[PDB]
Amino acid sequence: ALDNSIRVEVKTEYIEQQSSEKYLFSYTITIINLGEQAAKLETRHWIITDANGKTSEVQGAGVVGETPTIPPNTAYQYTSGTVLDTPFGIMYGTYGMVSESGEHFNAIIKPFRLATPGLLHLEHHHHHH
Amino acid sequence: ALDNSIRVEVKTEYIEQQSSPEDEKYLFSYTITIINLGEQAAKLETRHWIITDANGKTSEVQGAGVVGETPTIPPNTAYQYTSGTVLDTPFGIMYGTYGMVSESGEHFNAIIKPFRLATPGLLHLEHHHHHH
Numbered sequence: 100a101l102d103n104s105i106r107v108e109v110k111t112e113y114i115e116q117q118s119s120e121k122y123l124f125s126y127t128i129t130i131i132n133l134g135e136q137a138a139k140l141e142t143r144h145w146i147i148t149d150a151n152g153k154t155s156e157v158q159g160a161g162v163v164g165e166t167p168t169i170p171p172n173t174a175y176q177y178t179s180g181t182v183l184d185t186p187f188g189i190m191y192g193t194y195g196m197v198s199e200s201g202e203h204f205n206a207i208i209k210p211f212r213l214a215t216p217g218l219l220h221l222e223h224h225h226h227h228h
Numbered sequence: 229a230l231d232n233s234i235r236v237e238v239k240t241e242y243i244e245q246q247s248s249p250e251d252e253k254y255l256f257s258y259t260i261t262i263i264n265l266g267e268q269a270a271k272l273e274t275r276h277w278i279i280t281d282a283n284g285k286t287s288e289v290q291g292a293g294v295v296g297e298t299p300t301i302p303p304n305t306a307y308q309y310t311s312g313t314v315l316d317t318p319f320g321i322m323y324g325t326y327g328m329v330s331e332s333g334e335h336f337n338a339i340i341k342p343f344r345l346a347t348p349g350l351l352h353l354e355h356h357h358h359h360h
C-alpha cells in the first residue's frame with residue numbers, strides 16, 4: 100500500500116510539427132503495481148515545461164478518460180500527448196492512487212524528455228589510442 | 229486530371245483533456261488513410277489544414293508532408309498515418325488539402341473533406357423505434 104509499490108515507466112515520440120510553431124508529442128506510460136493489494140488511479144497531475152521556461156499544469160480525473168484498477172503484479176499501459184511551443188521540454192508529475200484498503204497515495208512519475216529526434220542531446224565519446 | 233486519383237478517408241478519437249484552471253484544451257487524434265487509385269505512384273509533399281473550434285475561431289496549419297515524411301503511395305495502395313490536434317472547445321471541424329506530385333512530375337491536390345472532432349456523447353442520443 101505504501102509508496103514505491105507503484106512503478107511508472109515512460110516512452111515518448113515526437114509526432115508532428117504544427118506550423119501556424121507548435122510541436123505534438125505522444126507519450127506511452129506503463130503503470131506497474133508491485134504491491135500486495137490492488138490500486139486505482141483516480142487523478143493525474145502533470146507539470147509541463149518547454150525550452151523557453153514556460154510552464155503549464157493539467158489536473159484531472161483518471162487518464163485518457165479512465166480510472167483503471169491495477170491488480171497486484173499487473174501493468175496498465177496507455178498513450179496520450181501534449182503540444183509544446185518548443186521542439187523540446189521536460190515533463191513530470193503525479194498520479195492520485197487509492198489502495199484496495201481505501202488508502203490514498205501518490206504514484207510518482209519522474210521527469211522525462213520531450214524532444215524531436217534532431218534535438219535529442221548526445222554526449223560524444225571515442226576510442227583512445 | 230489526377231484530382232480523382234486520390235481518395236481520403238478519416239476517423240478520429242478524443243484522447244484526453246489538457247485543460248488548466250481557466251483554459252480549456254481537448255486533445256484529439258486523427259487517422260488519415262490516403263488511397264491512390266491511380267495507375268501511377270503519387271507522392272504527398274505538403275499539407276494545408278483549416279481547424280475550427282465550436283465558435284468559428286480557426287487556426288491554419290501548413291507544412292511539408294505528414295508526420296515527418298513525404299510518402300510515395302504506389303497505385304492501388306492505402307497509406308495510413310496518425311497525428312492529432314488540441315482544441316479549445318469539445319467540438320470542432322477540420323478540412324484542407326494535400327499537395328500531391330505524380331511520378332510524371334505533375335502537381336495536384338487531394339481534397340480532405342471536412343470531418344468533426346467531438347468528445348463522446350456531447351450531444352444526447354436520438355431514439356427511433358419500429359412503429360405500429
Ligand SMILES: C[As](C)(=O)[O-]
Pocket residue numbers: 114124125126178179180181243255256257258310311312313
Ligand atoms: C496518440 As496522439 C499523442 O498522436 O493524439
